[PDB]
Design a protein around this ligand. Structure first.
Ligand SMILES: [Br-]
Ligand SMILES: [Br-]
Ligand SMILES: [Br-]
Ligand SMILES: [Br-]
Ligand SMILES: [Br-]
Ligand SMILES: [Br-]
Ligand SMILES: [Br-]
Ligand SMILES: [Br-]
Lengths: 713, 713
């Protein structure tokens, strides 16, 4: 209507301008976007009243420049916990809240489309961007993304789900050919995106850098048209990842509508200006105006609903304080208690000896486009000060001076920050600290970021020798006295845990909780927060145990391809099916209280499976319980994983003795497996497994499918 | 014709008698079969000139009573190497020879049908009968069985392939419900039987004890009629395993023609006489005479070709000496050299210190119906004496007296023989032996048998403490002097190998080689035989590494079901696909010489794949080379193993510098995967991997399938 109005007005060249970004703003010869720091803008066409639309990162919060040249004003953003921590909440409602808060900020700073959430599968722990992805499971990931997208888009701005698809490693991501069976695609990698597209209707999708089965995703017609549109019914537009692909017209033919960020010749001497090349292809009949029209329409159908289109006056002053409370809540529910041998929460009196250089160099989140620049970021130490806990002040001063000393030293100064030695304390000095203090609290920290994969080496997936030395020594001397030790994992992805976990009494997976980290952590120690998070990803006993062994491809040092040999058997699907025991299993997490499951009733009417059960707080402290419903399908015709997560739920805050009724519905189509051509729901007996984790099944029931069901996409 | 002649003559009750055995001969009230020791006989019907047909075990050689009461004559049989060792030859031609030798014996002792070969898949190393099965791979197993069956049946007698199907554990085999996807069935478990049925046309098939997906195999119409007959075109008859199933008429309705051994009421107070029950069902219209007719016809169509039918006068005097040479050959090519750090073969002079109680208590094969009673069985020690090798005579006397001493002791006398302590030698006594001798040779022995599964415990899958003590001590002191140590594995199935293999210099997998064992072993040490065997099964680093973790079912102590969670990913299919490293991989084996592969040419004409390559003996001793061709199919639509064995070959005896041309053809239908409904050969690029083992690939080529191909059975 209005869209088809503008379309009939546009000249050929205006249509071309519209499908290409204006170049990376503020860099190279490029002018800052009106929202300095923004990832990109579209070409304005003042004529027909088209404004430049603004795109900005990212998954951990709006990423824009805090300050602006010749400006007295401020533009700070809320830095939320990382996605893997958000996912650990297993809380849709909360994700929706996080989306609304980010959404308000996005709107009020004049941004039209937020580049989030990222929702690639956790194929392998070493992936540099796992921290900004949700899960190794498509249901958990898809559900979380949907909730986040509904939140963002309740605010009049756009969400962009990414990266479509199978961007599961950073190594050579812009060239690597990802070889994946159609079955693994549909069951694992596309599956999350399918859920998000159908349940939340994101304004836009960002095509991945990598090739899929021979074709760049930004140039893959099967992916962007056949799957995305013709099967799933996507009605937004697709944009390319930044500088992705190698042919602009092939991108438009495949259904990649918006090429970003534009002016690719600025980072690759080989690329042509994308507008020149497209104009040429229309001129030569390599590209038809009809195809160009469909691209422009896809973009316009969406962006006429953007605030920019309606000249919306933004305040440049969102409610930061209100949002910080949301970020704190998000983190509070996302901390995972991994181990507690009568160690947590800490007694009121408890005098804490705080170890680990990361108590001060607290990691708020990984680097890259998923980074953020908040007005502040509370470290673990500062959090403990603020809460006025009983910490060893002499030790804290010792660390403060140690860090500053070596950060100024040639071998350990920023360029990225080199990893500092952790065993600088005398064996005797720790003996004294053990006599003086009540408990020990050890922070071990890890950081990753876009563009770099982790390696299965010490200081990375494994503890460095100095870290294991520190833990062994602190453990021994604090255990010498009748005292407890606690480790805080300030990490973005699984690390080795088996070799040292038996040495310590408590283990909090604090991940990377954004600006409010220290505050969240302090409140978890004291029991003010009752941990309710659970793993969205499997912690392997050793790196050699992970099924995605081909990571990061062949040849290892410069991978040109990587094939998913493990296929659908990725994450817990692998460990359950082939009987490999994880260090900590998918969906595992402890509580400061106990829960009891009961009253299971499963019913299937041929179109809907209904699982009902009661969860009662059986302990002495209020808490939330995440419950998980796995379906074990019969063996029947084709091979299937041991079980598959089909639904989940997080109870309200239950006081002791309180209980809740849990009612979950699963459509029969979600019980299907893909056989290469069709989705099939095989007839036979199915098991319902309601768990507190994938291996802690509290309730079991069966139901039967009488007639097989088939679905050809 | 003749069959349909007799059929029209038979009375109703004669037809019934014919489909039931006459009871277990020589046991309970039962008379010995005319061939005493035979497993069973059919009912004679002198009227229409029908004789009692004789059935006898077994896979390791004809099993009958050597002596007969009131008889001056002898009836000894050749005891061949066990099937897992036969399979290790990877030699079809040789298997055919073994079949002919067994076949002649079977004929001349008045037996009509030999109950062999057994060809169940090696799902799990712990299975008690793995020793009498070929492989974890269906191509290797099916090819070996086919070659054996052609051999047996060139002699005018019948072969019986068993056990159909998925009899992969002994625990509760007569009741356990085996839960297997149709895909795993068709790709792994049925697949071997399919090959044997189509390539060799066995006279008969023996249905397994266990249930398959809810139905006893002897009562499973899908298996015995739909798969066996309607799809595969089987034209023999099916007999039940001994006392299998629980309903005689259900057995006949399913396509199980001959019920064996008859008189099931003799071992199970609950069963009725099968003739009574069948007569009753015909009487009541539970069973139609038409179905009975088809059973009797199936039996008769086959057995009118049996020697008994034509009153064949057998000599009761086969050529034992000629066959013993075949048994020696079989074993010679079936020994697997696993490790050789410049230790083998032994120098002419070498003075051998022989350790291990199994040097005298040499295991010729496992127990059960697969057992045999040969006129003699050469132990490892006796073999070394006979060959006149330079062994420590003082030590041999020490062992001889030790064994006899404790075999007479209460704790270690037969009832089965309790496992004897192996570390009875002083640390000092071994020091002296190390000074006196040139090399050490350590025999470690294992035995299993029908009806008992092995456990992943010391003394079984793992070395007992005394065995590892012995090896550690002998290794240390012989290595103290500049001397070598060798271990001989006289086992029927994989054992743990990683913990101790680095301590020793050589390792010969001698399996269990039947009556000629000692002779074969001696000739391998001296280099008279150049080892050419290769593993038909994977040796796991540890038992926890094996994918068939559900073995032996739920509940563990009294399993009522066992589901194949690992599905098609069994054996090397699992280890390759999910990157778990074996101790020794499928198809691995060393040689006293070296070989070089070359001149690869692969061509595909759309119906046949052709792989050609040259193998040259590049070393200093004559030898044979087993080569293996694995196909790695593209990922395409459905998940597939990393690679799959599709063909193999064993070269002639090549002298140094000699070479051979290898030409192998693979029908396009063998490139297929089963998707639950149809066999599919997906289009795309395929890799040819010609290996000296599954992980030692010497040649690679690609070919392409242009158009997909489909086959609905
Ligand atoms: Br993905
Ligand atoms: Br733990
Ligand atoms: Br990390
Ligand atoms: Br690869
Ligand atoms: Br089988
Ligand atoms: Br080795
Ligand atoms: Br054994
Ligand atoms: Br089971």
């Amino acid at each position: 209507e209005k869209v088809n109005e503008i379309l009939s007005q546009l000249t050929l060249e205006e249509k071309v301008k519209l499908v290409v970004g204006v170049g990376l703003p503020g860099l190279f010869g490029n002018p800052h976007s009106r929202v300095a720091g923004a990832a990109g803008e579209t070409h304005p066409v003042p004529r027909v009243g088209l404004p430049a639309f603004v795109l900005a990162d990212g998954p951990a919060g709006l990423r824009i420049n805090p300050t602006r040249e010749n400006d007295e004003n401020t533009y700070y953003t809320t830095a939320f916990p990382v996605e893997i921590m958000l996912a650990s909440t297993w809380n849709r409602e909360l994700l929706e809240e996080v989306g609304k808060a980010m959404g308000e900020e996005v709107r009020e700073y004049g941004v039209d489309v937020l580049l989030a959430p990222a929702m690639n599968i956790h194929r392998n722990p070493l992936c540099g961007r796992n921290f900004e992805y949700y899960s190794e499971d498509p249901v958990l990931s898809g559900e979380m993304a949907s909730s986040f997208v509904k939140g963002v888009q309740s605010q009049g701005v756009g969400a962009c789900i990414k990266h479509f698809v199978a961007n599961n490693q950073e190594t050579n991501r812009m060239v690597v050919d990802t070889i994946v069976s159609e079955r693994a695609l549909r069951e694992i990698y596309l599956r999350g995106f399918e859920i998000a597209v159908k349940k939340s209707k994101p304004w836009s999708v960002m095509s991945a850098y990598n090739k899929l089965n021979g074709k760049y995703c930004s140039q893959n017609e099967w992916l962007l048209k056949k799957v995305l549109r013709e099967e799933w019914g996507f009605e937004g537009f697709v944009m390319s990842d930044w500088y992705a692909g190698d042919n602009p017209v092939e991108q438009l033919k495949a259904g990649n509508d918006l090429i970003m960020p534009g002016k690719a010749y600025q980072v690759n001497t080989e690329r042509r200006d994308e507008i020149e090349e497209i104009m040429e292809a229309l001129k030569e009949g390599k590209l038809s105006e009809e195809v160009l029209d469909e691209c422009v329409r896809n973009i316009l159908k969406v962006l006429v609903n953007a605030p920019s289109f309606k000249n919306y006056r933004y305040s440049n002053k969102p409610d930061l304080e209100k949002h910080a409370k949301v970020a704190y809540e998000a983190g509070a529910e996302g901390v995972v208690l991994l181990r507690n041998e009568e160690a947590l929460p800490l007694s009121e009196n408890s005098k804490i000896a705080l170890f680990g250089t990361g108590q001060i160099e607290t990691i708020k989140g990984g680097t890259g486009s998923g980074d953020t620049h908040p007005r502040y970021a509370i470290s673990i130490l500062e959090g403990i000060k603020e809460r006025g806990l009983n910490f060893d002040e002499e030790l804290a001063k010792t660390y403060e001076d140690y860090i500053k000393k070596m950060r100024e030293t040639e071998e350990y100064k920023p360029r990225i920050k080199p990893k500092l030695p952790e065993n600088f304390l005398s064996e005797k000095e720790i003996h004294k600290l053990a006599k003086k203090n009540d408990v020990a609290v050890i922070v071990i920290s890890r950081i990753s970021g876009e563009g770099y994969d982790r390696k299965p080496v010490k200081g990375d997936f494994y503890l460095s020798d100095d870290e294991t030395d520190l833990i062994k020594t602190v453990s021994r001397e604090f255990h010498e006295q009748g005292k407890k030790v606690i480790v805080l994992l300030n990490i973005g992805s699984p690390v080795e845990v088996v070799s040292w976990r038996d040495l310590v009494d408590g283990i909090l997976l604090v991940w990377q909780a954004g600006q409010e980290t220290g505050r969240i952590v302090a409140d978890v120690l004291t029991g003010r927060i009752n941990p309710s998070g659970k793993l969205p990803t499997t912690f392997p006993r050793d790196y050699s145990d992970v099924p995605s062994w081909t990571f990061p491809g062949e040849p290892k040092d410069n991978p040109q391809k990587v094939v998913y040999e493990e296929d659908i058997y990725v994450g817990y699907r692998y460990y359950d099916t082939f009987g490999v025991e994880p260090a900590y299993e998918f969906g595992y997490g402890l509580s400061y209280t106990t829960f009891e499951y009961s009253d299971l009733n499963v019913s299937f009417d041929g179109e809907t499976l209904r699982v009902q059960y009661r969860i009662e707080n059986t302990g002495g402290r209020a808490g939330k319980e995440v419950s998980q419903v796995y379906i074990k399908a019969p063996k029947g015709k084709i091979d299937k994983p041991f079980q598959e997560l089909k639904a989940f739920h997080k109870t309200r805050l239950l006081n002791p003795g309180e209980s809740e009724e849990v009612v979950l519905e699963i459509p029969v189509r979600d019980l299907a497996s893909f056989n290469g051509e069709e989705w099939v729901v095989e007839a036979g007996e199915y098991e319902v497994r309601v768990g507190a984790s994938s291996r802690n099944i509290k309730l079991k029931g069966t139901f039967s499918v009488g007639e097989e069901r088939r679905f050809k996409p």
